[PDB]
């Protein structure tokens, strides 16, 4: 596994000692190389996993998340090229260092044979993200945003730490393989109820579950473009990955305790999808869309059927790519108008036709158009829920209707109509932006050819 | 339809129920009770795979018609005679069904009159 870890670490001296004008070029090319090398992780077994060593292992659940994390960094560099131009070279290098640190921590998080190492890195991804939000943010509120993103997260994870340690003192090991093999049922007890709550609520707050989600719109709205991309795409998947990993020890208490969260997520998707309909901001709309899709993933993980796990993995990867693309698009508009309001700039399809086709593709994928892997995840989760209880279909279908509605509302308000008369600084779309969106979208429609690579270990 | 008006406006029991037909033994009319003859055996009708609702007593004419249409293909106006025979057999089946319906209707009239006459005799 170190063939992936070491090069990303070597990126730091590379970007620090590079020329004043060649930091972006070098970072882009070498990050793309690391993506290509990490692509070898995709070959998996139907048996347990590929064991790299005592400390790092990979699985067909860790493989797609790792590949997407490694693939993201070049696009984050391409997106943050623009607004950092007037920045001093030292601060640009600090930005690149933050991004590389985030990539490195996520890479060690997703292998993490042991639960305490996983926890340490899962919480280590907090510092680069917080600094990125609170330092390279635009509005006054970024500072406020930072605090929320911190404390909420910590508010969820500090009990988990205790829980994890307590487990090591009764079972004797937190190594994932042993915990899988030496699993024992959790008898219905108050002590076990609180252990289950401590173990789950740490990851619920990061999905985020409806009700505990208030930090997400603020963090996504105030963060810089790269911060928004990494929050929407990968950092949300930490909670779902962690729940998939940790629900192997929580049976059979999960059947009893999933009700408060299944009800919260099933109703929460309707409420957040409805909120998306009445929104005066693009980034807020996309953030609430992410909340809805992650609520659906939460439901899938709590249902605990093989179809649930397959659909949850597919939806996680697909939504990561989709959300990254949508945030990029909104940022391209924001750089030209400097307002970040949906109603303000309209009729852009006549002015920027290719940006219009990129908008169409992104919204179609978010709308879960078949046979895209968004629909694969949604359909598998809906099918598993229907097996669980025949009445979930009304809620799932209502969510489907509303998501189609607000995705097309976001498309029509910005792209269609008559242009704003008084805005005359809308320059043609650069090659960098179109390359960004193309590199976002091509992996999606290519993975729809080979779904097995993203359907998880239960495929 | 007239029978609809008669049943929904006249006495409900006086006219038969199409769901419960027949309500009388087939031997009630006369003891002969000759039996219907099917020409197409199971194997040549299944090998024909006509349809599950086309497997009625008029199936043999249907088999001849399908043989016709398969053989003389390029002209689709070649054979109307086999179609005519099949249509005639279908009409005869439908007339047998009408006869059965009117038979149950008149037998119910008979039973009603018989019961009424016997009850009147018991009244006197």
């Amino acid at each position: 596994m170190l063939k992936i870890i070491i090069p990303t670490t070597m990126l730091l001296p590379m970007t620090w000692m590079s020329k004043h004008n060649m930091i972006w070029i070098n970072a882009t090319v070498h990050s793309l190389l690391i993506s290509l090398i990490s692509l070898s992780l995709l070959n998996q077994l139907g048996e347990n996993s590929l064991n790299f060593s005592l400390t790092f292992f990979s699985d067909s659940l860790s493989a797609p998340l790792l590949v997407l994390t490694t693939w993201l960094l070049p696009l984050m560099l391409m997106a943050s090229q623009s607004h950092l131009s007037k920045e001093t070279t030292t601060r640009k290098k600090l930005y690149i260092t933050m991004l590389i640190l985030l990539q490195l921590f996520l890479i060690m998080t997703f292998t993490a044979t042991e639960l305490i190492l996983f926890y340490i890195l899962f919480e280590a991804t907090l510092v680069p993200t917080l600094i990125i939000i609170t330092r390279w943010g635009n509005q006054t509120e970024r500072l406020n945003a930072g605090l929320y993103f911190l404390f909420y997260t910590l508010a969820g994870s500090l009990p988990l730490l205790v829980a994890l340690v307590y487990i090591q003192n009764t079972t004797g090991s937190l190594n994932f393989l042993i915990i899988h093999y030496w699993s024992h049922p959790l008898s219905n007890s108050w002590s076990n109820i609180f252990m289950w709550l401590a173990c789950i609520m740490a990851f619920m707050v990061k999905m985020p579950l409806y009700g505990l989600h208030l930090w997400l719109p603020k963090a996504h709205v105030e963060a810089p473009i790269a911060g928004s991309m990494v929050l929407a795409a990968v950092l949300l998947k930490l909670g779902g990955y962690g729940m998939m990993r940790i629900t192997t020890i929580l049976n059979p208490l999960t059947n009893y305790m999933a009700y408060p969260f299944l009800m919260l997520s099933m109703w929460g998707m309707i409420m957040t999808s409805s909120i998306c309909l009445r929104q005066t901001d693009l980034k807020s709309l996309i953030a609430y869309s992410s909340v809805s899709h992650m609520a659906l993933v939460i439901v899938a993980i709590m249902i605990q059927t093989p179809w649930s796990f397959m659909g949850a993995t597919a939806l996680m990867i697909a939504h990561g790519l989709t959300s990254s693309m949508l945030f990029c698009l909104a940022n391209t508009n924001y750089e030209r108008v400097h307002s970040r309001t949906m109603i303000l700039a309209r009729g852009l399809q006549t002015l920027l036709p290719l940006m219009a086709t990129w908008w169409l593709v992104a919204s179609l994928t978010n709308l879960a158009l078949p046979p895209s892997i968004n629909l694969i995840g949604e359909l598998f989760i809906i099918t598993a829920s229907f097996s669980w209880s025949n009445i979930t279909i009304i809620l799932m279908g209502m969510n489907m209707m509303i998501t189609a509605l607000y995705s097309l509302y976001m498309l029509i308000t910005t792209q269609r109509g008559k242009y704003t008369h008084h805005i005359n600084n809308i320059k043609p779309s650069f090659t960098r932006e179109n390359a960004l969106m193309a590199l976002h979208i091509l992996p999606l429609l290519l993975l729809t050819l080979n779904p097995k690579m993203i359907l998880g270990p239960l495929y | 339809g007239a029978h609809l008006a008669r049943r929904y406006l006249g006495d409900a029991s006086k006219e038969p129920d199409p769901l419960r037909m027949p309500t009388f033994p087939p031997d009630y009319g006369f003891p002969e009770r000759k039996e219907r003859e099917m020409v197409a055996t199971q194997q040549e009708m299944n090998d024909a795979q006509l349809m599950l609702q086309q497997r009625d007593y008029c199936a043999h004419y249907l088999i001849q018609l399908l043989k016709c249409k398969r053989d003389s293909f390029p002209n689709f106006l070649a054979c109307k005679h086999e179609q005519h025979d099949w249509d005639y057999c279908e009409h005869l089946d439908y007339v047998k069904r009408m006869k059965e319906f009117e038979r149950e209707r008149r037998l119910l009239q008979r039973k009603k009159r018989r019961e009424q006459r016997e009850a009147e005799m018991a009244r006197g």
Binding site: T350, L351, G417, K418, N424, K427 | -
Partner: protein, 178 residues
């Protein structure tokens, strides 16, 4: 569209607008031309029965039951011209109206074609650049204290002048640019 609205509609304006709407809905009701002509002359005669009317309270008492009589027989599906704000082709060619300033972003290879047009465009731009400095002062002088009272603009009063704020009225895209 062209003319700036006034502060209110006097009684005559309401009379004429009601008359025109009634005539249009009458034509929609009576499809055939002869029948519409008959009923239009009938309606005009019924409208001028009180033309010479003198007092105003009884006049405004009329054109109030007239409004109700219209709202009762208004033909919920009236005929609308294709390019009208209700027509089947209202904003149809709006997606082809591209602002002129977009031309300033054309690549020099694109601007190599059509050289004469860009010469004339540069002339127009210089004309506007000077005329704007004239127009700002014409408006600050001509405007009564306390801001304008009506959205009406004055014309050009000197020789070399041009009307104030003329650039975005003369440079409409087209009626059917594409």
């Amino acid at each position: 569209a062209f003319s700036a609205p006034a502060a209110y509609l006097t009684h005559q304006q309401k009379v004429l607008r009601l008359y025109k709407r009634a005539l249009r809905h009458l034509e929609s009701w009576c499809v055939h031309r002869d029948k519409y002509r008959y009923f239009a002359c009938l309606m005009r005669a019924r409208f001028d029965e009180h033309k010479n009317e003198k007092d105003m309270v009884k006049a405004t008492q009329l054109l109030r039951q007239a409004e109700e009589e219209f709202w009762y027989g208004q033909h919920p599906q009236p005929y609308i011209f294709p390019e009208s704000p209700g027509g089947t082709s209202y904003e149809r060619y709006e997606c082809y109206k591209v602002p002129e300033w977009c031309l300033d972003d054309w690549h020099p290879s694109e601007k190599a074609m059509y050289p004469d047009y860009f010469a004339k465009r540069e002339q127009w731009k210089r004309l506007r650049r000077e005329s704007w400095e004239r127009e700002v002062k014409q408006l600050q002088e001509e405007t009564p204290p306390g801001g304008p009272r009506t959205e009406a603009l004055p014309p050009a009063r000197k020789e070399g002048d041009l009307p104030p704020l003329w650039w975005h009225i003369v440079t409409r895209p087209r009626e059917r640019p594409m």
